[PDB]
Amino acid sequence: NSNICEVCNKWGRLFCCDTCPRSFHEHCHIPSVEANKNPWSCIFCRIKTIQERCPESQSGHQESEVLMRQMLPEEQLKCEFLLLKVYCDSKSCFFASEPYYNREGSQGPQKPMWLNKVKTSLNEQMYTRVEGFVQDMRLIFHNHKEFYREDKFTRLGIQVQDIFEKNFRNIFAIQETS
Ligand SMILES: [Zn+2]
Ligand SMILES: [Zn+2]
Ligand SMILES: [Zn+2]
């Protein structure tokens, strides 16, 4: 197995996947690495299994259909993996914890949002449809773009949104378009 966490790329107290060479810190994995279970399969492996069991799940889908899906166990897992893919980028540090807003010439957002809040919300089963999760994730980057206006720091919102969107299209097998 790898000797660094797949998500944060640091060593430490790592839990190893039994079906692939990835390793994780306990709270870097989503959901947090389970107490017992031997063997243990990581989220990458669990998603791969869904795909292998139903190869047709990879045919293209309309975003609007994906968003209306109820958060059954497979959709819950897919959103957890999508969230984890965002944390895998180092620029996610900017969006992880609760923000505050005091910049001359801007006003903070009406509805602040951050990754760890989405993480808690998924853990607590607060989202009933995929749309709930996706709306909160997109709000993170939208709030950032609006607040930072012309400061070049706005680009960090663009960059991490692009990671989110590419992974959303992959995980939920959104029909490819130009
Ligand atoms: Zn880690
Ligand atoms: Zn694995
Ligand atoms: Zn099938």
Side-chain angles (χ1 to χ4, degrees), residues 30-36 38-173:
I30 308 179
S32 292
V33 168
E34 298 72 10
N36 209 287
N38 318 61
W40 180 72
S41 266
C42 78
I43 188 153
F44 294 78
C45 286
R46 296 166 68 186
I47 291 283
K48 186 196 299 301
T49 295
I50 307 314
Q51 288 164 9
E52 286 176 346
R53 285 175 159 163
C54 280
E56 70 277 25
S57 71
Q58 305 160 280
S59 291
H61 301 80
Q62 300 297 113
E63 180 172 309
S64 60
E65 177 267 323
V66 170
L67 295 182
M68 295 302 313
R69 295 181 191 165
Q70 297 176 9
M71 288 284 255
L72 295 183
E74 286 187 0
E75 301 319 300
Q76 179 73 32
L77 196 71
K78 285 177 165 207
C79 294
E80 291 164 347
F81 187 47
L82 175 51
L83 181 58
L84 177 136
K85 287 293 200 146
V86 170
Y87 280 107
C88 287
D89 198 283
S90 65
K91 291 160 180 286
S92 72
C93 70
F94 299 109
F95 298 107
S97 72
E98 183 176 3
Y100 63 86
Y101 295 98
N102 193 3
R103 184 195 181 230
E104 179 179 334
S106 299
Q107 269 297 323
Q110 304 297 308
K111 184 182 175 182
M113 194 50 61
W114 60 100
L115 304 166
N116 295 347
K117 186 174 167 74
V118 182
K119 184 181 277 197
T120 294
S121 296
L122 271 171
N123 174 246
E124 294 183 8
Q125 307 161 297
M126 301 285 293
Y127 299 113
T128 62
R129 289 169 197 275
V130 171
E131 183 178 48
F133 167 80
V134 171
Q135 283 173 342
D136 278 353
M137 293 293 287
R138 287 173 169 166
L139 181 66
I140 299 169
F141 313 118
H142 194 254
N143 281 351
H144 178 94
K145 286 164 80 180
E146 291 311 296
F147 181 75
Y148 289 105
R149 311 285 204 110
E150 313 305 282
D151 192 300
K152 66 192 170 171
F153 190 60
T154 58
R155 178 155 172 270
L156 274 292
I158 293 167
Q159 289 176 322
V160 183
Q161 179 149 24
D162 193 50
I163 297 301
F164 174 69
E165 295 299 337
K166 286 179 188 273
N167 281 280
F168 173 67
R169 289 189 306 266
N170 181 259
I171 293 165
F172 288 92

